[PDB]
Predict the structure of o-Succinylbenzoate Synthase.
Amino acid sequence: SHMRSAQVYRWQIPMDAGVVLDRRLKTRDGLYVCLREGEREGWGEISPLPGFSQETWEEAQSVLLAWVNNWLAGDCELPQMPSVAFGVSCALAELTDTLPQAANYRAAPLCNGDPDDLILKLADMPGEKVAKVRVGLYEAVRDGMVVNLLLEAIPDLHLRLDANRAWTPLKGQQFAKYVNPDYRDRIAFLEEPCKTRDDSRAFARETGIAIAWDESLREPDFAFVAEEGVRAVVIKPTLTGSLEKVREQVQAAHALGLTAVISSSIESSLGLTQLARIAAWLTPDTIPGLDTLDLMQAQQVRRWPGSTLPVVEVDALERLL
Amino acid sequence: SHMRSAQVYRWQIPMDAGVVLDRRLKTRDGLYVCLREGEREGWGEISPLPGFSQETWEEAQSVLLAWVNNWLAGDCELPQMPSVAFGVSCALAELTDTLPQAANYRAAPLCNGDPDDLILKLADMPGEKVAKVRVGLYEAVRDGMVVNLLLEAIPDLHLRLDANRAWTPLKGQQFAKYVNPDYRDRIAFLEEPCKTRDDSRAFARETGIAIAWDESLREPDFAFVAEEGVRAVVIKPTLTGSLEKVREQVQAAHALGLTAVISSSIESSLGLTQLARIAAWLTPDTIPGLDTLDLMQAQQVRRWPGSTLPVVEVDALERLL
Ligand SMILES: O=C(O)CCC(=O)C1=CC=C[C@@H](O)[C@@H]1C(=O)O
Ligand SMILES: O=C(O)CCC(=O)C1=CC=C[C@@H](O)[C@@H]1C(=O)O
Ligand SMILES: [Mg+2]
Ligand SMILES: [Mg+2]
């Protein structure tokens, strides 16, 4: 039986109180697609992220439904709208059993709070110690002092930092000055230190601290480039597009000797598990940036193994078809 | 002096009689941009190709002029229309002296006609013997017999072939059957043998004859993929987009162990010389597919070294600004 059918689900997941993204997030709104052909089915998540995605939830819903209406009649071109392309391409890959299963469902811990308490937490980590910490909220001196404390405390810690383009050149300098140069190599990367990319490149070259691009990847005219100081790229599939485009970006990063990190756009557990599979497959030696499930009050449909959050089943979701 | 100025030229170059592309081409219509900032200038060619480019000459002219009007005020986003993106990005690269100069202005000879006469010509070739021959005009038996004759005649010849998606699986088989399996390795690649890409992939896997993608690269949803039988990709910048996108595609091809060939879209001598520079830079060990200048009755502005065609100078071209 080659018979095609499909369902599209619309949903809202309550966020934990206080989730910040410069702006608060109360609810995660999104969509699932389920595609079926004969005995097989595949799922994907279409959840554009407010303030990051160009498209809204409602625009994505429209494009998704139109795409599904075509697919039901036979193969068609992928959507270009990135959230929809991501979710549909994932569902297609599951249908054909070409998105691999994974042993490991990994995430770099996203950490905040009292520095000493974090030291205690990170020292008890098994395996390679990688954690992600936001910078650029406090002043630069405080950030540099705290990073230095963490790195001095745990000799095998490697920190990913993210300034979300907060800094001027001077603030980047004030930060770096407080990080012991003998530890700077264990900043695995600092995402988007400065307001402009040229200022970020100068920060990297001048301080020796490795940077990564994140927001930059979605800007018009971005190109993958090997350049002194850039050590990594952060690929957020929901903001990027198809699974194949994601794969092309990982490949581009690796060809240039750059680390490619698969990272969360605050997807539901369904999309997060798929990101975990993408990471285990395409970036097997890079822990992905997926530690956002614990910002949410529930899982849906597909479980992240080990999570104790309650699970909303398919039958409780709103159906559009 | 950081003062910006620009000129846009519109032109028509008469083609030699009988140039075929399933359809005749009388004239090559196109555009140049010249960008100047202080003491520096850069040039590029914007010449969409009828039947291949989505955009027309006139649509490209519009987009180019609008882009130039922005650039004159300061840096802006590149055009997305591929011919315009190519030409503008080339001009920008020249402005900053980031499109390298080249020693060699190379092209794989594009050959036709009596097989024996071609044998004589190719035997007198200095250096590595690579030539390109069209297939799929004659019947498949004739094509296979002639390819076999050429390869048997010249032991160090490597042929690039192009069927322009002419064949069914059966025609591909009729062709292959007449090529001695001991010589098939010296078909460097056969571009687009079959009407569908799946049929082309099966041709490659089943006959052992390497294929290349050309037209496929510009189709929606193309992805760069290592797969048995695909050995090369043909990148035509005018049909592709920016110099940076071209560079990304070469990089993608090389990461996958594929040959990347920079190829002509029947540009004027100006654009062809730039393609030659792109090839010497990005694909230093791959002779580019640039042997189309001798289809044209004149060069303009920039000379291909060694050509005896007359040169139309800048002062004879129509100016739009
Ligand atoms: O990359 C990760 O480790 C987790 C995801 C993450 O840090 C982010 C997800 C979405 C928006 C941003 O707040 C933030 C980032 O800039 O990387
Ligand atoms: O690639 C080359 O060697 C020369 C250019 C070439 O063969 C082509 C240019 C433009 C259209 C096509 O006729 C043809 C091709 O399909 O590669
Ligand atoms: Mg980031
Ligand atoms: Mg071709």
In short: The radius of gyration of chain B is 20 Å.
